[PDB]
Subunit: 89 residues, 3 copies
């Protein structure tokens, strides 16, 4: 079987973020042009998807972590991860 991943990137360097779901936990690895390192994101989930967008040169990331039938949105706007407003119904 296997872990499940999601990936996003931005800019021209680029920056890359890769999220991995394994045993109900999602972790994050990061590339900013030099090498890979572990990111701050660490939240529960069996499944993960991600999207991101720039405002000028500032990144915003949304990570959708699902356990069973519950999907939690996690927000990065440049200063820490927080739960977002997403609901499924």
């Amino acid at each position: 079987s296997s872990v499940q991943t999601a990936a996003t990137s931005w800019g021209t360097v680029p920056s890359i973020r890769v999220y991995t779901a394994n045993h109900g936990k999602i972790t994050e690895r990061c590339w900013d042009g030099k090498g890979w390192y572990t990111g701050a994101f660490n939240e529960p989930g069996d499944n993960v998807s991600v999207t991101s967008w720039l405002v000028g040169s500032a990144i915003h990331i949304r990570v959708y972590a699902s356990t069973g039938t519950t999907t939690t949105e996690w927000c990065w706007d440049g200063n820490g991860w927080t739960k977002g407003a997403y609901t499924a119904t």
Copy 2:
């Protein structure tokens, strides 16, 4: 276990679309800057991926819904969802 999602976004507001596969059915939730609401997309699938692109300010979305070994592409060009030309072989 859990549902499986895919996500896309565009612009700077942004607009966000989150697709969720659960019990062989995919549904869609939408954010356009104000709050989340249910979108028009509703098609069968155990698995889902998505990509989207802008022409100027008009969005185009492609959703790849898979059941067993059959992957159906669904197209949004601004005026309703239709099946696209994608085939796997």
Copy 3:
């Protein structure tokens, strides 16, 4: 049950790439504006995610293929697929 896919696109034509994981093998289908055709990517994986970015008009693609707990990054910079530096720890 079902195969698992990931998708990316770029430009305004657009170009689209759709990766499908089935039986521990990932393959690639390609659209460049005319029709769909099979791409060069063919590597092992039970799970797949993808991201891509432009430099001017040149595409770069990163495909994250996972089997069990091992995630291999595959790089397209315009001249063949190679393994990238990604590690999970």
